[PDB]
Amino acid sequence: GGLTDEAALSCCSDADPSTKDFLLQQTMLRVKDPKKSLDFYTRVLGMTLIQKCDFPIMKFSLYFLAYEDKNDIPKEKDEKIAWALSRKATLELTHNWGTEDDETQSYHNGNSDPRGFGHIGIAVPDVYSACKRFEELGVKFVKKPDDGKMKGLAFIQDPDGYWIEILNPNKMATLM
Amino acid sequence: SGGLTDEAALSCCSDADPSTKDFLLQQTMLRVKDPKKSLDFYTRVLGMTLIQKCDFPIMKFSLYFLAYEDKNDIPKEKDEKIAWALSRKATLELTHNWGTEDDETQSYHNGNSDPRGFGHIGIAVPDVYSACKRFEELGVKFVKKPDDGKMKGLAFIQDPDGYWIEILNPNKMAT
Ligand SMILES: COc1c(/C=C/C(=O)c2ccc(O)cc2)ccc(O)c1O
Ligand SMILES: COc1c(/C=C\C(=O)c2ccc(O)cc2)ccc(O)c1O
Ligand SMILES: [Zn+2]
Ligand SMILES: [Zn+2]
């Protein structure tokens, strides 16, 4: 039966003053082909690329994506990194050079064994209109809004097969 | 490859379609073996707040939503609470499948060993070294202490499932 509400709450402590300005800054996903990933996240989901880092010795690049106004990205390089890495709710996409041409290689999405990570989730003003647009753009769906018993809630998949939940906060008060 | 030039990157980027203008990155979902340890670590050790819990007695799971929010902004009424909680940016959604906490042969995978995908979440903090001194005192397991290895000034800890959490100071990043 899992925890009651009260039991769950008893397991929680109020935050220590030392953690007062902490923020949940990023979730990192490895991506096979950064070309396909950047197109998906900016053109399909409307995020902005806010920072790109290359490491030639380790052979990887990092791409920071966020729902930010690109007008707010600062022009100087040092201040740009500090602002990008102080933004809440970024997605960090790691590209290990070479994966895009390797026909055997693919990453795992965490939704089959071995499982752990499940999905990221985008809050939208309207799941039906978002998902209609998605359909028109050729996006691959895991669960259309009306499929299954959780009506009004959908999952799509990025080019790597990672799941993305599409949810409408103003409607979710309709199941427990 | 040598990976993408900055220009080739930008060329794969589109401006945000107006249909997306109010979208927000609302959650990252992790499955947790035992919600008791997970709630303790993310509140008491990391300073997050539990803002919503949901239970699904038929499908035998619960969801716990965790976020850096003042507990006094949480609405008192339940329906409003959900709307508020599931509209916050940057929440962590922990899924408990009932019974896992008692199963000695069951563990989740953190993405950082074959087969890889997900890599970590990350917390921006004002002071990586002080934060990590406190983590150590509280018994936190480390993947990478701040001065271990090449990238000095950045850490990785693990939660009770072994998921990697980066600890970074945005103003120190970029050597
Ligand atoms: C992907 O996360 C990053 C990286 C991360 C780069 C890594 O590949 C890495 C993996 C394991 C380890 O123990 C150390 C580094 C480097 C800089 C940065 O700011 C950031 O957010
Ligand atoms: C874990 O993410 C969630 C879920 C998650 C669970 C789902 O119902 C689900 C449905 C179909 C499928 O193919 C996979 C999972 C349910 C409600 C919610 O608010 C939320 O954020
Ligand atoms: Zn990172
Ligand atoms: Zn979810």
Side-chain angles (χ1 to χ4, degrees):
Chain A
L3 296 192
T4 61
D5 295 355
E6 305 65 16
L9 273 173
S10 76
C11 287
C12 303
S13 301
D14 295 317
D16 189 85
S18 48
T19 68
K20 75 192 255 297
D21 289 301
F22 288 14
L23 71 87
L24 183 60
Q25 198 275 321
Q26 49 169 255
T27 293
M28 186 288 253
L29 301 174
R30 297 171 189 73
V31 303
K32 167 174 189 67
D33 193 336
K35 279 187 191 211
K36 291 186 197 183
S37 296
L38 293 169
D39 173 68
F40 176 91
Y41 280 107
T42 61
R43 175 168 66 71
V44 175
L45 279 179
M47 312 187 174
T48 304
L49 179 67
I50 67 176
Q51 183 66 235
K52 178 180 174 277
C53 299
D54 304 282
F55 295 90
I57 295 339
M58 306 190 256
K59 290 140 144 47
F60 70 89
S61 315
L62 305 170
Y63 303 83
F64 290 89
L65 289 154
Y67 282 110
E68 292 279 348
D69 197 318
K70 54 213 272 275
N71 290 318
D72 276 352
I73 307 171
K75 304 254 162 285
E76 195 272 311
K77 200 65 224 65
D78 296 0
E79 295 179 355
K80 173 157 130 74
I81 287 164
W83 173 92
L85 294 203
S86 55
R87 289 318 94 183
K88 294 178 46 186
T90 72
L91 190 67
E92 177 191 358
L93 302 179
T94 296
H95 175 224
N96 292 314
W97 297 355
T99 49
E100 62 283 25
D101 306 306
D102 179 358
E103 340 175 310
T104 54
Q105 182 288 328
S106 70
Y107 287 113
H108 175 63
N109 74 357
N111 288 307
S112 64
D113 287 346
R115 304 176 204 216
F117 174 72
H119 51 264
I120 51 171
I122 314 293
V124 299
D126 187 316
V127 169
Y128 292 88
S129 63
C131 287
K132 167 183 187 167
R133 181 170 164 273
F134 293 152
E135 254 177 70
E136 289 155 11
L137 294 176
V139 155
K140 212 258 213 189
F141 281 77
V142 167
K143 179 223 170 299
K144 296 166 234 206
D146 293 313
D147 298 341
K149 292 168 200 276
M150 276 184 182
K151 306 298 193 206
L153 181 76
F155 293 81
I156 60 167
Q157 81 176 50
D158 80 357
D160 282 278
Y162 297 109
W163 294 12
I164 305 166
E165 185 186 314
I166 307 293
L167 69 135
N168 175 355
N170 291 330
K171 284 298 299 183
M172 300 290 272
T174 64
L175 211 110
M176 176 87 154
Chain B
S1 70
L4 295 192
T5 67
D6 290 358
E7 296 103 317
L10 283 163
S11 296
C12 300
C13 286
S14 306
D15 285 318
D17 186 273
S19 79
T20 69
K21 69 192 162 76
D22 287 318
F23 288 15
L24 65 87
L25 194 48
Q26 193 287 311
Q27 54 171 244
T28 299
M29 188 285 253
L30 302 174
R31 297 176 183 78
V32 302
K33 180 170 176 67
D34 171 5
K36 307 184 288 318
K37 295 198 230 208
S38 294
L39 294 173
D40 177 63
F41 175 90
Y42 283 109
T43 56
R44 193 174 50 94
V45 176
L46 286 179
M48 295 185 111
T49 306
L50 176 65
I51 62 173
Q52 177 66 34
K53 173 179 183 278
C54 306
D55 302 282
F56 297 89
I58 301 323
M59 286 183 290
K60 295 172 189 144
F61 67 92
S62 320
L63 304 185
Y64 294 88
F65 290 92
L66 285 165
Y68 290 114
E69 296 282 343
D70 189 324
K71 64 176 328 177
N72 304 310
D73 298 350
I74 300 162
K76 330 298 134 152
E77 186 274 316
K78 34 144 180 34
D79 295 65
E80 190 50 23
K81 179 191 154 114
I82 295 174
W84 171 92
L86 273 39
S87 56
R88 299 304 88 185
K89 286 167 57 169
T91 75
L92 187 65
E93 177 201 355
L94 303 183
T95 300
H96 174 215
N97 299 112
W98 299 357
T100 63
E101 60 266 50
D102 285 326
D103 183 338
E104 60 276 57
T105 57
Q106 177 289 326
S107 62
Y108 291 116
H109 176 258
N110 69 13
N112 297 295
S113 60
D114 285 353
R116 306 193 224 295
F118 167 83
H120 48 273
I121 53 174
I123 310 298
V125 299
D127 187 358
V128 165
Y129 295 80
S130 67
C132 289
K133 304 180 180 172
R134 177 166 167 284
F135 299 146
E136 281 168 322
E137 303 178 14
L138 287 178
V140 169
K141 172 167 199 205
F142 282 78
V143 164
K144 179 202 178 304
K145 285 206 249 217
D147 284 335
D148 290 347
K150 161 179 284 159
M151 297 173 152
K152 306 308 174 186
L154 175 87
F156 285 89
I157 61 171
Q158 278 173 297
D159 83 351
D161 289 273
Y163 296 107
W164 293 22
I165 299 170
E166 186 178 307
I167 305 298
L168 62 131
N169 173 348
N171 303 296
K172 294 273 167 187
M173 298 291 252
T175 76

